[PDB]
DNA sequence: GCATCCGTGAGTAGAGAAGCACAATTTAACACTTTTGTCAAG
DNA sequence: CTTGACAAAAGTGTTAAATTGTGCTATACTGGGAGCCGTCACGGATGC
């Protein structure tokens, strides 16, 4: 199937982003009846909830990176495997 | 913007939308912006 | 541009990992009052003040310059988060 | 669509 | 009765209620036609509904009928004097027991609330609500200075004795949140109401000496 | 300083009164000076004669006459007391008892009619206002082609706005003609039968076209009687209502035949007769006489539609954007229309009041309630789109505002429905509406300005003057004529050469129905009066308009309105000739009524001894604050004992110099890049401008405060403000108000006010605080008025209005109000916007010392440095020619008047430059100075660029450069010359109202919204900056997840987060992790109010409480 | 725990009554003289919460020590005034009414 | 329903919508209790349905409900959430923010690519919470509360406050935004240089990315607060780190206007 | 297939018009103890 | 540190005026009122 950007955006799984674009009454009416569960995948959903967007520094690929100095690293290493 | 492989985590969808939409006013407007909109 | 920004971008696979490392290191420096720094006394960032030349209070500036030296180890699942915070407090009291 | 006209018709019977 | 705060259908339904009451109280023994007697109850029910339902802030019937009289009197004075009457002029025409002060208060009461969604300007992108600050929730500055005062006060109370600081925190309600009586404190510690007043002042006096020596607490007084 | 005048076109007539569109229209509506028995049936007089007489159906309320009394207060008093300048209205009415035959007459007070000032504005609630004229489709009968189906036309009948339904006549494909009323389509045959038409009448009149009449001859209803046909139509219009003859005739009569509900209008009636070739008795679609309906317009409308469809030569379609089909509703018509609406509401109230209550004993005073009349009038002058806050930055600003034409407003258009056709320059705008003047943006083509020579007639159609041409000679007979009449003649251009009055050129450029044509002199019938009639007043003030692109001429004319008055304002060196008329017609200056001698001259007033002997004293408006905050003052320009003639200037008004409009300064301008401080429209100025106080303006700001009655006690305006030292109260007098003349800075108290604190027990920490210091808490708190950040100046006026004062109508609960006026003398600074008349605008980006600016070889530094790169793309070459002419006038000590399209040409400018060179360089020779070494180097480069002829002497080559407007310019920093000659001249530059002082704003924390808990908006409210969707998109594209989350939560609406963030920062700590926004909590609760169960879940689908347990019931 | 999903669903009449802290029975909002909320109105403190923190409508309780307590006289829970942004009411309709979203 | 400073009350349209529903619902209960005829009950039930519809979505079916004296439709629950002025697009997808400012921009020819000219008066307000801490660390003020009182009055501000403000903004960056933000370089991070005056000095080479000229343009200023926010702006959003166009890869910060002409 | 009505959407900033009688409920003015708080006495 | 006793502060029970709520007016009166308008394209459904 091929649809325009307007129709494609309104047919997305996340009802939070679709309701915030257009046809809020229509989007919420179908989402509430279907009991849709927004998984907060895109950027708009996390903006609405004030959450860290899953992009840039908020992406899971870099968000959990740790930083430590050698002195602290060796201290932790020398204290556990001893 | 960096002339190098993209970094994992970049919101390229937002960049793509802004890249297309930014010169929209510079179009002369089947021709110009109406042609882009129907496509 | 930030000093050595090209070298900073070259040490990470994703440019946003560099920001995470710098920001996390900056708060580590702020939490311990810059006493956990890996910079030598002649390498500490400085600012020009009327009273005299004093230490730079911007921890982001410190964190970027620390990463250029290469004495910082960054990565995922290096050490447990609880173990990291507790051990730093012991060896760097604050 | 007109509640007033609908009511007047009802009372007119 | 339209244009007085109630929709046309509201007036009819309220008028129907008076019509129902008219049927119950109607007496055909008097040989009067129904419309003669029903009109009184239909108009009565419409009037009461307007006096009860036409305002967002409900005003009793006596004040509504007072407000109606004031407008009627003012309008009659306006058309005779060829200008807007003053409050003294309106009060004099009203009768005894009325002065310019009472007229002004009645007009102040008669002020309908304004909508928060009233637009400003030709553009339909601004309302009154966008310009009304919230004065209930404390500001970040007010919340911060309260925390600053709390930590400086408990720091000053540390210089006091273990019991002396406890009494002030208990008498001023710094622990339970409520100011207690020297008696309500006389049961916590088993002491006399004059014991507390004896030390509570002594602990108060020592804080005065400490404050004068450091002056780390005056700026919070404003 | 003599003035040299250019131009060859002789204007036979002067400009009409520039405010006559406002003044004359309102005079015609009021008719206040004409005696009642000679009042014509127009204006509010027509409103009375339309609603009256009021008949109960045997009580009649008839209208005899009305009168307007003197205004209760003068205009200055209304402004000072926030009153409306208005005149009481009395109507002399009689009540007639048709049964008894007794008449009682009395004069009732109908309210107050707002009065127009002499300049053409209104004072509504103490504020100056201008009613903008409205343009719309003129009423009448129109014939447009059907776009869906070619070869078919539709008839449109338009009455006055809100004065009847629009009617459509269309030939259906079935062949029967249809009439559409109130979105209900029905066959016109039914209605046409109702108005008494048989089968033979239609065939005898409309049967000579073709098959069209065959579709109008349905005999199923022709045999039916008109009475039931009237009822049959009544069913189609509003279906369901019980068919009754009495009710049916009233509905049809009220729809097309009632003058009280349907009004085609004087313009609509005239258009209908002109188009259909008939004569209407009234202004209705039909008449109802002798118990039957007679046709007025439907038959001629259908006759024209059939003939147009058939294709007869004499019938044509109507261009709805043609300016003969578009009319103007002026202030008089707009006020009269709202007066009629209020009068109709009053009549309805009278009718319902005269049918009940003491029928025998009734008087017109008791029956008439004037509040509905006053409410409609008050609503029109206060809350109407066309009633606008008067723009009076400078006198030209007020003059433009009164000549503005708006297609929007009630009964007009909205941008959505405004397309490229109503927004475009139609060919009929020539000489009637300025083609270039319009607000760029969403209002382009919707708000326009009246042309300089154009005037609105009685019917509302704009007429433009033309000179009659007969036999090839141009006469002095001037005919004001509409667009539809203009299409019938061949009109030549005003620039056509004439030898006396005979047309000299054999080929004449002319217009035939808006198209340019070349015709012979004998074919010319009319001539343009002047090139100035095509443009508005603002556009006519742009010299060398013919050398500027229309897009940039639009900017130049608009920015003349935004120019602020200057304490040393100067008339431009190059003028167009309208500078004097703008000042004279704006009524901002003062002129002698007749010949006389000035007796007393003072900064406050002028007394003139006229020849007749009467002493006339003219108070001078001094340091008055305009609607925009600019200071409007009149400075006397005469001396004691000076003899003045009639019309001689007595005192210059704001932004005027010796009676000439002075919107800026005449400064020395060098057109050259300068170290990047000219980058992208930025402007470099010299510090010498500040030294001699050019571009220095006076601005006055008004601050207001009220002392109110409160339930806790009344607010007191007093000097005793608790918990403040003497330094904060130093400038306050004993009454608590700041003394007049005190310098105030942000945070300083303008007036002291104490309000009783709300009854609330203090926090235990505060209670211990007061206990430690032994200080009893007071009952009042500081609620005084202070200077907002970024403001201040000198206190020049204090106004204190108290309850019970004569004419002061304070709101209930307000004991008194104090108004403080603070004046600041603003000098030109970095960030202030400068502009010229040619659309070149920019902000001051750098102020240089005098020794740094480029200077002439004689040592004269330039004042302003403009980037030459702003010229080529904008194609506004008039500034270059103004600079060249200004350079010649700078050395010759003269100013110039060059009318637009007929003025100074380059040969005339160059010959002036030749004379200016003889004083520029001939003075140097007499002083004993030759040619500079630096000049020789520049001339060496100049001949390499082809700017000077090789082989000539340095003096001759320097003269060649001067004739091009270029001089050898030295760099003040280095002393070396600029490697190429620079265009240096004198140009008129304006200082605009957009100033960085009033636009700079910053906020750390401040007020928040009530519901969303987000920061407010606006500098006045100390609000935050709006971070909209596009700004959010920018952070998402950057990947700045944490920066985005702070703005969403920590800095906007995370109540816990923003409190903790502020406390963390002031402790030297990092801000904590943010929490859920309060707006999301609002959304969830609002979604719950829509009966929607919105729940936030966790990884395991279990509910998560984002309300901290505050909404969970146990 | 961390919010990971947002679910939207129809609210049953029982669920709506479970949300509400009381039924709004009168159309009154605030007294015209005292300017204080009216009982059983759209602003009632007994339904939606106290106007000011830890203070009941009558004034018997004015302290934080009584958190979670409902005054026996006034009937207002002694808690933070911010609950008036979250605590909802309900109107018991005499006859059922259709939701316009699911109709139009 | 809030009392304004003037003394008059301001209330939302939902209260009037709720009152109409309660008035009609209560009247139906009394009409049912009185055993009213079905015609009267039918009209009341029909009005109850319309009252519910107006509260949920005013104007969706039939004539919109308006308050007496005006033709403005009452703002229902659907109107609050939908549209450009609705909750989603006005308060959720975009918000007004603290620590923000706005001023007219001028060309900063002497500025470095990563630098902007920020007025001192703006920076004092923008960095006030940081400045109060810095003033307390020095001998300018005894504590934060006294420090804030000093800054409230302009004439009470000492010259040592401005020196402390320089130490506050050392290394920190601000966000400059010009509307409309058509692309991401409509917001860029610059190190603020304190300048006398009220105008923001902008680098000439970033004007093209902002589509900014100096004929009256204004820009918004924003302060990233935490270490993450500062690190993101200094690394990812710095003007000197964004030289190529993300749309085409071509240099976006490049010589233009006088720079090209001089070269 | 097709024609029609309804619904949706259409850039971002900033600045800006009944009395009256009577009952029923509430408020406010009193008195009253009763209670804390306080300055003498050891 | 306990009297202790003592006045102010606060609580409390009546009683009055004041405010508020409710019922009732008997010639006959019996279906409203304002609008009515210059955009355009797009789905989507609803029937033909
Ligand atoms: Mg610009
Ligand atoms: Zn209570």
Short mmCIF file of N, CA and C in Angstrom, two decimals, chain H residues 154-233:
data_model
loop_
_atom_site.label_atom_id
_atom_site.label_comp_id
_atom_site.label_asym_id
_atom_site.label_seq_id
_atom_site.Cartn_x
_atom_site.Cartn_y
_atom_site.Cartn_z
N UNK H 154 18.28 48.47 40.62
CA UNK H 154 19.43 48.67 39.74
C UNK H 154 20.48 49.55 40.39
N UNK H 155 20.06 50.61 41.08
CA UNK H 155 21.00 51.55 41.68
C UNK H 155 21.75 50.96 42.87
N UNK H 156 21.33 49.81 43.38
CA UNK H 156 22.01 49.15 44.48
C UNK H 156 23.00 48.09 44.02
N UNK H 157 23.13 47.87 42.72
CA UNK H 157 24.03 46.85 42.20
C UNK H 157 25.45 47.39 42.18
N UNK H 158 26.35 46.72 42.88
CA UNK H 158 27.75 47.12 42.92
C UNK H 158 28.48 46.66 41.67
N UNK H 159 29.67 47.23 41.45
CA UNK H 159 30.49 46.83 40.31
C UNK H 159 31.10 45.45 40.50
N UNK H 160 31.27 45.00 41.74
CA UNK H 160 31.79 43.66 42.00
C UNK H 160 30.82 42.57 41.55
N UNK H 161 29.54 42.90 41.41
CA UNK H 161 28.57 41.92 40.92
C UNK H 161 28.88 41.54 39.48
N UNK H 162 29.25 42.52 38.66
CA UNK H 162 29.56 42.25 37.26
C UNK H 162 30.80 41.38 37.11
N UNK H 163 31.79 41.57 37.99
CA UNK H 163 32.96 40.70 37.97
C UNK H 163 32.60 39.27 38.33
N UNK H 164 31.69 39.10 39.29
CA UNK H 164 31.23 37.76 39.65
C UNK H 164 30.44 37.11 38.52
N UNK H 165 29.69 37.91 37.76
CA UNK H 165 28.93 37.38 36.64
C UNK H 165 29.84 36.78 35.57
N UNK H 166 31.03 37.37 35.37
CA UNK H 166 31.98 36.82 34.41
C UNK H 166 32.44 35.43 34.83
N UNK H 167 32.69 35.23 36.13
CA UNK H 167 33.07 33.91 36.62
C UNK H 167 31.93 32.91 36.48
N UNK H 168 30.69 33.38 36.53
CA UNK H 168 29.54 32.50 36.36
C UNK H 168 29.50 31.91 34.96
N UNK H 169 29.71 32.75 33.95
CA UNK H 169 29.48 32.35 32.56
C UNK H 169 30.74 31.78 31.94
N UNK H 170 31.78 31.56 32.75
CA UNK H 170 33.04 31.05 32.22
C UNK H 170 32.86 29.62 31.74
N UNK H 171 33.14 29.38 30.46
CA UNK H 171 32.98 28.08 29.86
C UNK H 171 31.57 27.71 29.50
N UNK H 172 30.57 28.31 30.14
CA UNK H 172 29.18 28.00 29.85
C UNK H 172 28.78 28.57 28.50
N UNK H 173 27.75 27.97 27.91
CA UNK H 173 27.22 28.41 26.63
C UNK H 173 25.74 28.72 26.79
N UNK H 174 25.22 29.50 25.85
CA UNK H 174 23.80 29.81 25.78
C UNK H 174 23.29 29.37 24.42
N UNK H 175 21.97 29.18 24.34
CA UNK H 175 21.32 28.77 23.11
C UNK H 175 20.65 29.98 22.47
N UNK H 176 20.99 30.24 21.21
CA UNK H 176 20.40 31.34 20.45
C UNK H 176 19.43 30.76 19.43
N UNK H 177 18.21 31.29 19.41
CA UNK H 177 17.16 30.80 18.54
C UNK H 177 16.48 31.97 17.84
N UNK H 178 16.32 31.86 16.53
CA UNK H 178 15.54 32.81 15.75
C UNK H 178 14.36 32.09 15.13
N UNK H 179 13.16 32.64 15.32
CA UNK H 179 11.98 32.06 14.71
C UNK H 179 11.81 32.58 13.28
N UNK H 180 11.32 31.75 12.35
CA UNK H 180 10.94 30.34 12.52
C UNK H 180 12.15 29.41 12.52
N UNK H 181 12.09 28.32 13.29
CA UNK H 181 13.18 27.34 13.33
C UNK H 181 12.90 26.26 12.29
N UNK H 182 13.26 26.58 11.04
CA UNK H 182 12.97 25.68 9.93
C UNK H 182 13.86 24.44 9.95
N UNK H 183 15.05 24.57 10.50
CA UNK H 183 15.96 23.40 10.60
C UNK H 183 16.63 23.45 11.97
N UNK H 184 17.52 22.50 12.25
CA UNK H 184 18.09 22.41 13.59
C UNK H 184 19.11 23.51 13.86
N UNK H 185 19.77 24.04 12.82
CA UNK H 185 20.70 25.14 13.04
C UNK H 185 19.99 26.47 13.28
N UNK H 186 18.65 26.47 13.35
CA UNK H 186 17.93 27.60 13.89
C UNK H 186 18.12 27.78 15.39
N UNK H 187 18.70 26.79 16.06
CA UNK H 187 19.16 26.90 17.43
C UNK H 187 20.63 26.50 17.45
N UNK H 188 21.49 27.39 17.93
CA UNK H 188 22.91 27.10 18.02
C UNK H 188 23.44 27.57 19.37
N UNK H 189 24.51 26.92 19.82
CA UNK H 189 25.13 27.23 21.11
C UNK H 189 26.34 28.12 20.89
N UNK H 190 26.43 29.18 21.69
CA UNK H 190 27.54 30.12 21.64
C UNK H 190 28.04 30.39 23.05
N UNK H 191 29.34 30.62 23.17
CA UNK H 191 29.88 31.11 24.43
C UNK H 191 29.57 32.60 24.55
N UNK H 192 28.82 33.03 25.57
CA UNK H 192 28.44 34.44 25.65
C UNK H 192 29.60 35.31 26.11
N UNK H 193 29.81 36.41 25.39
CA UNK H 193 30.76 37.45 25.77
C UNK H 193 29.94 38.64 26.26
N UNK H 194 30.17 39.04 27.51
CA UNK H 194 29.39 40.13 28.09
C UNK H 194 29.74 41.45 27.41
N UNK H 195 28.72 42.16 26.94
CA UNK H 195 28.90 43.41 26.22
C UNK H 195 27.98 44.46 26.82
N UNK H 196 28.44 45.71 26.80
CA UNK H 196 27.57 46.82 27.17
C UNK H 196 26.55 47.06 26.07
N UNK H 197 25.34 47.42 26.47
CA UNK H 197 24.25 47.62 25.55
C UNK H 197 23.13 46.62 25.78
N UNK H 198 22.12 46.71 24.92
CA UNK H 198 20.93 45.89 25.04
C UNK H 198 20.73 44.93 23.88
N UNK H 199 21.67 44.87 22.94
CA UNK H 199 21.53 44.05 21.75
C UNK H 199 22.46 42.85 21.81
N UNK H 200 22.01 41.74 21.22
CA UNK H 200 22.84 40.55 21.09
C UNK H 200 23.71 40.69 19.85
N UNK H 201 25.01 40.45 20.02
CA UNK H 201 25.94 40.47 18.89
C UNK H 201 26.03 39.06 18.31
N UNK H 202 25.76 38.94 17.01
CA UNK H 202 25.73 37.66 16.33
C UNK H 202 26.87 37.58 15.32
N UNK H 203 27.48 36.41 15.22
CA UNK H 203 28.56 36.21 14.27
C UNK H 203 28.04 36.28 12.84
N UNK H 204 28.76 36.95 11.94
CA UNK H 204 28.27 37.07 10.55
C UNK H 204 28.14 35.74 9.83
N UNK H 205 28.96 34.74 10.18
CA UNK H 205 28.97 33.48 9.44
C UNK H 205 27.82 32.55 9.79
N UNK H 206 27.09 32.82 10.88
CA UNK H 206 25.95 32.00 11.25
C UNK H 206 24.63 32.62 10.84
N UNK H 207 24.66 33.79 10.19
CA UNK H 207 23.42 34.45 9.79
C UNK H 207 22.66 33.64 8.75
N UNK H 208 23.37 33.01 7.81
CA UNK H 208 22.71 32.23 6.78
C UNK H 208 21.97 31.03 7.37
N UNK H 209 22.58 30.35 8.34
CA UNK H 209 21.92 29.22 8.97
C UNK H 209 20.67 29.66 9.73
N UNK H 210 20.74 30.79 10.42
CA UNK H 210 19.58 31.36 11.09
C UNK H 210 18.62 32.06 10.15
N UNK H 211 19.02 32.29 8.89
CA UNK H 211 18.28 33.13 7.96
C UNK H 211 18.04 34.51 8.57
N UNK H 212 19.05 35.01 9.27
CA UNK H 212 18.95 36.24 10.03
C UNK H 212 19.66 37.38 9.32
N UNK H 213 19.03 38.54 9.31
CA UNK H 213 19.67 39.79 8.92
C UNK H 213 19.57 40.77 10.09
N UNK H 214 20.00 42.01 9.84
CA UNK H 214 20.09 42.98 10.92
C UNK H 214 19.24 44.20 10.60
N UNK H 215 18.00 43.96 10.18
CA UNK H 215 17.01 45.00 9.94
C UNK H 215 15.87 44.93 10.95
N UNK H 216 16.18 44.56 12.19
CA UNK H 216 15.18 44.44 13.23
C UNK H 216 14.93 43.04 13.75
N UNK H 217 15.69 42.05 13.30
CA UNK H 217 15.49 40.68 13.75
C UNK H 217 15.78 40.55 15.24
N UNK H 218 15.06 39.63 15.88
CA UNK H 218 15.23 39.34 17.30
C UNK H 218 15.49 37.85 17.48
N UNK H 219 16.23 37.52 18.54
CA UNK H 219 16.56 36.14 18.85
C UNK H 219 16.26 35.85 20.31
N UNK H 220 15.91 34.59 20.58
CA UNK H 220 15.68 34.12 21.94
C UNK H 220 16.96 33.51 22.49
N UNK H 221 17.18 33.71 23.79
CA UNK H 221 18.35 33.19 24.48
C UNK H 221 17.88 32.18 25.52
N UNK H 222 18.57 31.05 25.59
CA UNK H 222 18.23 29.99 26.54
C UNK H 222 19.49 29.52 27.24
N UNK H 223 19.34 29.14 28.51
CA UNK H 223 20.45 28.74 29.36
C UNK H 223 20.30 27.25 29.67
N UNK H 224 21.14 26.38 29.11
CA UNK H 224 21.18 24.99 29.59
C UNK H 224 21.78 24.93 30.99
N UNK H 225 21.11 24.20 31.89
CA UNK H 225 21.41 24.29 33.31
C UNK H 225 22.39 23.22 33.79
N UNK H 226 22.09 21.95 33.55
CA UNK H 226 22.87 20.87 34.14
C UNK H 226 24.12 20.57 33.32
N UNK H 227 24.90 19.60 33.80
CA UNK H 227 26.10 19.18 33.08
C UNK H 227 25.76 18.50 31.76
N UNK H 228 24.73 17.65 31.75
CA UNK H 228 24.29 17.05 30.49
C UNK H 228 23.87 18.11 29.49
N UNK H 229 23.04 19.07 29.92
CA UNK H 229 22.57 20.10 29.01
C UNK H 229 23.71 20.96 28.50
N UNK H 230 24.65 21.31 29.39
CA UNK H 230 25.81 22.09 28.96
C UNK H 230 26.72 21.28 28.04
N UNK H 231 26.93 19.99 28.36
CA UNK H 231 27.78 19.16 27.52
C UNK H 231 27.17 18.95 26.14
N UNK H 232 25.85 18.77 26.06
CA UNK H 232 25.20 18.60 24.77
C UNK H 232 25.36 19.84 23.91
N UNK H 233 25.20 21.02 24.51
CA UNK H 233 25.30 22.26 23.75
C UNK H 233 26.74 22.54 23.32
#
